[PDB]
Amino acid sequence: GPNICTTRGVSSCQQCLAVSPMCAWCSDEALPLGSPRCDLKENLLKDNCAPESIEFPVSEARVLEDRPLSDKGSGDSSQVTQVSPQRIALRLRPDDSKNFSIQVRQVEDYPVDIYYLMDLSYSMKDDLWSIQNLGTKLATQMRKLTSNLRIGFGAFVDKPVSPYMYISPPEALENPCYDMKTTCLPMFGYKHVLTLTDQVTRFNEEVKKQSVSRNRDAPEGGFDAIMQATVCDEKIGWRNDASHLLVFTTDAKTHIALDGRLAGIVQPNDGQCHVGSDNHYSASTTMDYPSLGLMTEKLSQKNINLIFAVTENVVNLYQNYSELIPGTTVGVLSMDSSNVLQLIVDAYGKIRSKVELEVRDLPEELSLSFNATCLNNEVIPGLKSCMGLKIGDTVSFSIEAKVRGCPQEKEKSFTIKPVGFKDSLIVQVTFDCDCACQAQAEPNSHRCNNGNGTFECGVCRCGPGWLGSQCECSEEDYRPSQQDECSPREGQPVCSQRGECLCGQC
Amino acid sequence: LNLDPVQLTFYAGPNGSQFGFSLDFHKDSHGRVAIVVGAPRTLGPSQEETGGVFLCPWRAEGGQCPSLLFDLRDETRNVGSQTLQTFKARQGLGASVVSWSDVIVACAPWQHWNVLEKTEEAEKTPVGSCFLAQPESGRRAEYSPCRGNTLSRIYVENDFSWDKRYCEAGFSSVVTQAGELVLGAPGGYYFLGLLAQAPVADIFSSYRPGILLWHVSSQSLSFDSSNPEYFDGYWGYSVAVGEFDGDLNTTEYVVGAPTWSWTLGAVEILDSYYQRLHRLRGEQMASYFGHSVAVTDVNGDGRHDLLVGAPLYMESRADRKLAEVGRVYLFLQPRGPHALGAPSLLLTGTQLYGRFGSAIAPLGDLDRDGYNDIAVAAPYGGPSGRGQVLVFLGQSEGLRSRPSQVLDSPFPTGSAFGFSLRGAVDIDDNGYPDLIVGAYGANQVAVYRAQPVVKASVQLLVQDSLNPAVKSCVLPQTKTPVSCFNIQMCVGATGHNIPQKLSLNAELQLDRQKPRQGRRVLLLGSQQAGTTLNLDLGGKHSPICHTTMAFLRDEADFRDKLSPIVLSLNVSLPPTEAGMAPAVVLHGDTHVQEQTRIVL
Ligand SMILES: *[C@@H]1O[C@H](CO)[C@@H](O[C@@H]2O[C@H](CO)[C@@H](O[C@@H]3O[C@H](CO)[C@@H](O)[C@H](O)[C@@H]3O)[C@H](O)[C@H]2NC(C)=O)[C@H](O)[C@H]1NC(C)=O
Ligand SMILES: *[C@@H]1O[C@H](CO)[C@@H](O[C@@H]2O[C@H](CO)[C@@H](O[C@@H]3O[C@H](CO)[C@@H](O)[C@H](O)[C@@H]3O)[C@H](O)[C@H]2NC(C)=O)[C@H](O)[C@H]1NC(C)=O
Ligand SMILES: *[C@@H]1O[C@H](CO)[C@@H](O)[C@H](O)[C@H]1NC(C)=O
Ligand SMILES: *[C@@H]1O[C@H](CO)[C@@H](O)[C@H](O)[C@H]1NC(C)=O
Ligand SMILES: [Ca+2]
Ligand SMILES: [Ca+2]
Ligand SMILES: [Ca+2]
Ligand SMILES: [Ca+2]
Ligand SMILES: [Ca+2]
Ligand SMILES: [Ca+2]
Ligand SMILES: [Mg+2]
Secondary structure, three states: OOHHHHHOOOOOHHHHHOOOOOEOEEOOOOOOOOOOOOOEHHHHHHOOOOOOOEEOOOOEEEEEEOOOOOOOOOOOHHHOOOEEOOEEEEEEOOOOEEEEOOEEEOOOOOOEEEEEEEEOOHHHHHHHHOOOOHHHHHHHHHHOOOOOEEEEEEEEOOOOOOOOOOOOOHHHOOOOOOOOOOOOOOOOOEEEEEEEEOOOHHHHHHHOOOOOOOOOOOOEOHHHHHHHHHHOHHHHOOOOOOEEEEEEEEOOOEOOOOHHHHHOOOOOOOOOOOEOOOOEEOOOOOOOOOOHHHHHHHHHHHOOEEEEEEOHHHHHHHHHHHOOOOOOEEEEOOOOOOOHHHHHHHHHHHHHOEEEEEEEOOOOOEEEEEEEEOOOOOEEEOOOEEEOOOOOOEEEEEEEEEEOOOOOOOOEEEEEEEOOOOOOEEEEEEEOOOOOHHHHOOOEOOOOOOOOOEEOOOOEEOOOOOOOOOOOOOOOOOOOOOOOOOOOOOOOOHHHHOOOOEOOEO | OOEOOOOOEEEEOOOOOOOOOEEEEEEOOOOOEEEEEEEOOOOOOOOOOOEEEEEEEOOOOEEOOOEEOOOOOOOEEOOOOOEEEEEOOOOOEOOEEEEEOOEEEEEEOOOEEEEEEOOEOOOOEOOOEEEEEEOOOOEEEEEOOOOOOOOHHHHHHOOOOOOOOOOOOOOEEEEOOOOEEEEEEOOHHHHOOEEEEEEHHHHHHHOOOOOOOOOOOOOEEOOOOOOHHHOOOOOOOEEEEEOOOOOOOOOEEEEEEOOHHHHOOEEEEEOOOOOEEEEEEOOOOOOOOOOEEEEEOOOOOOOOEEEEEEOOOEEOOOOOOOEEOEEEEEEOOOOOOOOOOOOOEEEEOOOOOOOEOOEEEEEEOOOOOOOOEEEEEEOOOOOOOOOEEEEEOEEOOEEOOOOOEEEEOOOOOOOOOOOEEEEEEOOOOOOOOEEEEEEOOOOEEEEEOEOOEEEEEEEEEEOOOOOOOOOOOOOOOOOOOOOOEEEEEEEEEEOOOOOOOOOEEEEEEEOOOOOOOOOOEEEOOOOOOOOEEEEOOOOOOOOOEEEEEEEEOOOOOOOOOOOOOEEEEEEEOOOOOOOOOOOOEEEEOOEEEEEOOOOO
16 A cells, blocks of 8 residues: 555566565465455555465575684694684565675784885995895894794895997997996896795895896885785795785885886786796886786785885875885885885785775676774774784674665675785575566466466466556557446447446446 | 777888877868878988878878988087087977978977087987978978077076977977967976977078078067066966957967976967966866867867866765876857856766877867867777877867767877867868877777768658547458558658768557557557558658558557557667668767657
């Protein structure tokens, strides 16, 4: 009677449930009139239309894998749980929304992977001298924060191509700093020096065999190094069960995409691994610099926290870059990088002091709402990130998934994942826009003009010729009605000259 | 809207030559329009990727093009104690081609130059050079404003002041109406950004073959700046000319500095003396605001409007909040000279990493509606990421936020379809400006031709005999006197260069709301509510008129007499799409509703 459920037509079961969640459909053979077999559940029940045949799908969110959150990540890193639930099954009927929860906890003794991406330009010659014993000093300071630390080293200057590199005279190619009467290394784009290893003494050995180079322009090809350090997992040596810190140390500006046109390079960065067996970025002279969007995507894809260890003269520039790249922090590096050890420890604490959610493979018809609940019981709504946390905290994010209309795939899955963590919640969406009566799928039967209309879910759905209650109009259904029901049997014209043949009724 | 995407002309250069990197229209003395296409990686005589320029004559089928020959030999002249040297290997001849009158200006931004003087040298730096050429007369000239004989030592003592060694002049080139060639040198003044301008007539008259370092007495260059905002700004990445200060005796330059003020980007408008009049700051960091600029009057107020492309702009999608789509900014020039403010329109791309705004081409009046139109390209946009060109139409308040047409890349993936765009030139002389799209990845250029636009004029005149109480008009088969009315329908087709074979189909409709069985009004010829007529409006300026006779049922026949009578007239092109591509684009009121009602 009341509510749009009754007013918005009848058609079949597909139409009436597709309007609004409350609406229900009766498929069994019952009173032809009364309930438009499309009213609410209690109205339909009121008309006794449920011989255990009432159709009314309900949106549900049932978990599948619900391993509890781990308390310490020191041992059995493959069995460290930082997100619960890990997998849920979500059923959504059209235009309906169901809410679910996800607890994120950052364990204490989680393994850490620190890759030191050092700008080996000439202005960082003194910086290279303050790093000779960084590996030993880094292990001691990281000892209290983790029991499994791996460190690696990589270097970059810029693209080895004019005008970035001096090309004259021929002695300036094998020694770019000939004219200040010094010996340097030939310009390189990005060389991978040390694979991520737990033996921290290798970092000290490999860092004192490095030498700086000399380029011409102020900006450096650092984003090229960040891309290659991110996408070359097997070469750099990232671990799945570890935190990934990419310490990016530089003192000058950085080249961005479309800056490679100055050197004659127009081919965009494809985000692939181009480091060969010689540990050199082989596509540095043939491929443009990566853009912020592409670089951000690969950082999120590989779960890498990027740290800008930049000097004071470019601290504001990279602080503005960090606002566009999630999961990144900026530290003020010294002119000789004498405090990079304290910068890494502070950045790791700063990075782990914030938990930010990230959704991937979200269907275009799904809309998510996050109510962040940080320390204490502050349910800050509309926020998918908590800030000000510490190591060991357990935040919770209530999420509401709303679907516009009804997608035809009826089976989609997306993942909700904290930034920089492998652990994720896999949500399996199972849209329910069809009834159980459609499983029968009754074809044209004798109840619809002896085989002129499908008898599915009680109401005879049938082609434009034969319409009406019994799908027998054979014409339009209005003036000719379906079976001249307006004229009861014979001797009674259009309901005794009261109701004519209109709207397919007396 | 008009650009035919089915009949495409494909000009192909040598494979692996980036044929299509830069393209422009060239007009001969006879008026024939040719296409000059830059191929900055064409193999030189010694199998080195020097570069090349192809002059493509206009053909419907297209194909290979003749090569415009330039000097591709390295030069070495000993003047005084110095030794001037030019290195044309990998110079990228064709990275910027612009045509003015009978002169074609092909630039090589990456041509190197060194000055040896005993042990000291000036360093082999990509000073950049531009080769001017008159194809109809064979006159060849060069313009390298950033060549110098100053040794490196001197620059070090001067803190690299006036260091035009890394100019890369020709990166972006434009010629003003008077004939002043304005070259863009983003690497000038130690990558600060430079702009060099010299008349084309004076370049030809001053160029002496064999002389490598010479000064054009009428040239002018921008000024080096100590402001840290300009450092590494690449001021000169894109250059455009226009009128932005009132009087038309002075031309104004529009210079794109995509990395101005720490990769923020800016677009400055300056007079002929490089005095900044107005600066437009970028909106997002590293968005490359200023990678492409274009000056055209889109809103038809008589005052030029500025369009700025930001190919790497990242939008807030509320699901990712940073999606690299690209954006184009539109600035409408107000009444006051120095009054440009916030952008009047923000055209944002939709495909991720599509680089929307990488090329903006003023198309002129594409549909001839009285307002100029533009075409923005996404070289890696589209659902398949192969390239897209989007056509935007001008209007009274600026541009349409919605593209009137989308051109998908006919070339495979990675062709960078849309990197170079050029329009507002009628290459087939059909009265409508066309568009040439360059895909250097495929080493091919696509030519899109604008087919004519027909402005439909539908007028259905129906007699007001909608009351059935008259019962006077009779039926041919049986008198049955009923209040019938005549249906006079007229259709008008207006548009420039409309073909004489245009045969529109007019679909009449009577009592549209009622079903076919319940049709109250019928004709007296076929007794069917509504009919289809194939009027041949092509070749007839008159709004062809024709009257038809229709009758209504009896009073008792329609119990729902109260219901209104809906008369509709729909016109559309003839169903000849399968036989041939639609020779016209029907624009205007295609369908008209002549709704009436029964009174008596
Ligand atoms: C990083 O981004 C910030 C903005 O988020 C940059 O600072 C901003 O710089 C602009 C000038 O480029 C300042 O604009 C001026 O502000 C004054 C005072 O409000 C106003 O009177 C002027 O008309 C003009 O708007 C702006 O205030 C300033 N914002 C802040 C918060 O300081 C910063 O320079 C960027 N760092 C880089 C690029 O390294
Ligand atoms: C995030 O938090 C907000 C605020 O708590 C949630 O929305 C609110 O949820 C409550 C409980 O469902 C709604 O309460 C009900 O409102 C109706 C009127 O709309 C009233 O008749 C009921 O008696 C009851 O008070 C409340 O309206 C709703 N507010 C809004 C603006 O929608 C939201 O659902 C939370 N999201 C997640 C992901 O959990
Ligand atoms: C959805 O929100 C309501 C109201 O806050 C709450 O009672 C219910 O438990 C939530 N459901 C889930 C699965 O979070
Ligand atoms: C522009 O130059 C013409 C030259 O014929 C002159 O007549 C006119 O006054 C000038 N307009 C100015 C200076 O505004
Ligand atoms: Ca230093
Ligand atoms: Ca550099
Ligand atoms: Ca002027
Ligand atoms: Ca204007
Ligand atoms: Ca127009
Ligand atoms: Ca044309
Ligand atoms: Mg440096």
